[model samples]
Target: SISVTAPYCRFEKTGSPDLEGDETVLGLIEHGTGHTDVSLVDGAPRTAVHTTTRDDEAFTEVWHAQRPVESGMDNGIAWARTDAYLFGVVRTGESGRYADATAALYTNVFQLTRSLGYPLLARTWNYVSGINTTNADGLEVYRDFCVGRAQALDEGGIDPATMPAATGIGAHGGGITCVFLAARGGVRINIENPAVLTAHHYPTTYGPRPPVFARATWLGPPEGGRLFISATAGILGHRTVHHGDVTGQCEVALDNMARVIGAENLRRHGVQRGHVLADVDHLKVYVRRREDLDTVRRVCAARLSSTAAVALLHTDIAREDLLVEIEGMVA
Candidate 1:
């Protein structure tokens, strides 16, 4: 078998990194424990984010790829890049500027990636405070963020249908943190599940502008790649389901994940290989109620592989009705 090692994802909970020779660190997400913080850390690496996790302990999830150059902070944007891959991070720098900060920071990243010739986004993780609460403009925080993000993507010349997979969730006590991976090219495929309305097509009731992202995105060779799943929840056909029932909600969310990366969906997108629920490399489960962590873990254990990497966290969901949300990757 030919070895494939350039792009990989791994978790580091103890705040240490094991860097191998010739391998470069693209990004690091420091999952913290709180309700309103998602900012940059001073001591952490430049290409890193300090965001709330709400788990029992804080952890760091890092992405690595072979070879790197020009990796450091440029202005407020922290970034690293190889010939074909670029990992970058930016923050609001202060509280209460979701729209303003997102527009400017995303524009910065977009412009940088364009200049570096890696303009296509692969996957993104967004952390902002009070997702369900109102912004200063009387708009919901998430919605306001959508306005800025969508604008940046559009101005970046990204096609709405081909936007990258994304995770937009709440934080505990800080400003917004956006971590993104951009690529020049790969075996790319953007996917959306039939289970929910495409986020970008949501009614204006959801936001002034709709959320811009694909349900998931696959990258690598056609035979093998990673399908990065977005922050999925117990929603069907654009409606939240199983409200107040963490178990049911989690089950539905997992089901949605399976469907999005299943063989049938792969075929629809012209990919041949399919991955099952157990095939997920890692799962980050967000639980709105800390008391539900055990229950969420139990449900996931029963449904997924015993050896699967699972981390259940106590965090708020994007919607008030959603008790549980999930995002992961199929490798």
Candidate 2:
């Protein structure tokens, strides 16, 4: 079971949600407006600016939008050095224009965290309006997002040909938005391991093409930590969970994730599960509507555990009828 606190952090073994000592802030930055806020699991809270925009502020306008936080940081620059992964939450407005804004932001992140590079961007969850709706360009908004992301990564010295794992989806929240969570010193699949299948390697029978494992996690780099899962669904060429039911999807997702973690242990000289660091940190569920949350939660509790840190958020599915998508972080 995953735990949740006011400011979410996962540490089930310790039984304390506090992120003190295990990690430290090299610095904190805020950009954009008048209401930006930052603090710690145990630190004083302060409002730096409030650039985040809601639907009301975006009324009667398609172009009305704001940058999450253009540029503001404490302690000059750089994050605190620690083996515990660093996580940053990004929030954006429901502006109609998607690709350009997203690309610009990625550039900013690359500039802001100069030494780390874009591979540090381990996972991202996008929230877009009428997710499945055709955009003005006659393409699905999610498609536009992929293009922008690929381009951005290329610009930042990452090749989509050698693309990082990811998950992309639609949101019904009226405006375009993106929220990315990044990790430093994370593992990279520079070589193919035919001996074992990595999480990103989905078997090719599920669909027309591979369902991208965009937001999924990787294990074993110099920084030894557990793998955290992002929301996963019918990702072809990989584990196929759900098997045509929302609830079933949740079960299959967890099962597949556990399989991946277990496989990692085997790859590292066939170690025991307990000896390995793989443990589920938390899970977030994005359903078609807020109403569907209870049923999904019930399913997860019965199959996985009731204490999973379940979050209820809405998203537009490309297949349109696909009702549930699950994501998590393991450390």
Candidate 3:
């Protein structure tokens, strides 16, 4: 077997901090926690760096809050170092002007990584607040956002094939907030094969959410190593699960996920993993509101494992009546 080293995700700071001397961002990797520096670049020995760009004014306020211990690191915008990863936050205004916000976003992403000597971005996550209130099409406003991101990748010397995996969900409060995470290619842990069915002719099922879970996943090249699962909803194989009621919708969504994992023989094509062998890494849960956090947590704990990291973020789902949308990542 070819030998390669890849670091798992790390948690640097638990809370936000103010900025420091000449520092515009704060960054760290899984290790090198204590040796973080704002000036470190790629190829720098014994170090990993993260990069982020944000509103200058917000950065200044955050920097001022961390007085006397200044490292030039700002709040709203920061990056960490570890195995060539770029991660940090960027916030914008509420004017709702696509051209202006898109231009600003493009510039921010470019400036953050252009000097780092990277050819392409590995992954990106977008959390845009008040997304539902932004435009006429509501959450579909993401279509325009995707266009901006696509252009940014193109300008960064990235082609569609090289583009990073991404997640974009609506936030409830802020205008538009985004954080980008990048890493060197060809370095990931094993991919998830989860004894799940992928023949495209798998048995159909239903859920309580909309956009119904159309498909589970298609096996990528073995060398890719990253499990890619797309838009799973309250339905199984293109069929809707339950109708009405938030909790019911959530239950059906989880049940549908079970189907894809091959939990049932007749209902499932051939995929099977009895929870004991199911390899779930991280789960991204998108709920319509934060108020429903506790109920969903209880439901997930009952169905999935309790040790999984659950992020209670707010995002409008494809179905208006759908209360939540859950996605699983196993590796």
Candidate 4:
């Protein structure tokens, strides 16, 4: 029921046919899709920068709304929110001390979420520069990011169990960009994969505070609920397989995604009448190597029905050896 595509970034009410009354402009997302009209407008009405793309050349400029989605600026942070969801987006460069910056941004995000009545965060996406590289503190950039996030959660007095479905990927060189989607009021149930270890429970070998997120998050009422899946790869039991093989890795990744989307898996995780991966509403595919784009796209096209909308972008995978990562939402 979602209305969005890879070729164009647009958002429409999922189930409703038309705007019941006055249509709202909740937020805007600007990326490197050759669209220049997208820019930050300060003190504007019903507008905010939810997320922006850098160095990927992927499609951009996504506008979302429902009612009089109020948008305003806090200091320099841009944010927008509707009766159903709230969005916060920030772009920051590496200060050689990104942990401090990340912690501050996250604190603001949670603070705003509470102020807006959207007390629960459902999903989040983190795109950073040099994600796998070591920072000045001798910690991997990803680990540092985690440390900062944890610090914010503790300092902000937020529970770790409220961690939403999250994805972290490498963006060439545009600094650290983060986007979050929070629900107005709902029980955001975190779902874990039975075939693999839950991300939050991963051993310390992965990072200082292993990525804090669930395999997927189910939101809203069960009758017409939606699922947000974290970035999934060809890893099983926290181990990457099919090393150096693009096609092989693509196949395994799809299989893992299917496992997460399977009805049986959802039932075990407390969801009834779960939908399959083929029901993907919107998908974003990340290829570590540019040369593997076509191959990965072809595989995904064949595996995912032609009706599925997919976006392919060139970016480095979270793991150096991992060739591909796929993430998206489903109804």
Better of 1 and 2 by TM-score: 1
Give the count of colliding residue pairs in each prediction. 11, 34, 22, 0
For candidate 3, write residues 70-102 as lDDT tens digits.
211233344443433444445554445443475
Q: Report the lDDT of model 4 for residue 21.
A: 38
C-alpha RMSD between model 4 and the true structure:
5.5
Please report, in order, the local distance difference test score of every candidate based on alpha carbons. 0.75, 0.43, 0.42, 0.70
Regions of candidate 4 where Cα sits further than 4 Å from its true position: 1-25, 33-57, 61-65
TM-score of candidate 2 versus the correct structure, residues matched by position? 0.60
For candidate 4, write residues 1-331 as lDDT tens digits: 5432111124332233444532444455543322222134442222222222333444433434454347766644577666577666665665565788888878888888887788888888787677778788887787788888878888889877678778788765655777777787855788777878877677888767767777788877775567888888889899989999988888988888788878998888788866766787567788888789889999999888787767776777777889998887775
Best by TM-score: 1
Question: Which candidate leads in lDDT?
Answer: 1
Ranking by TM-score, best first? 1, 4, 2, 3
The better-scoring model by lDDT among 2 and 3 is 2
lDDT score for candidate 1 against the true structure: 0.75
Error of 1 at 1 (Å): 16
Worst 10 residues of 3 by lDDT: 57-66
lDDT of 2 by residue, 83-182 (tens): 2233333334555556676666555555544554323544444544555766677766665555555456657885443433344555434343333334
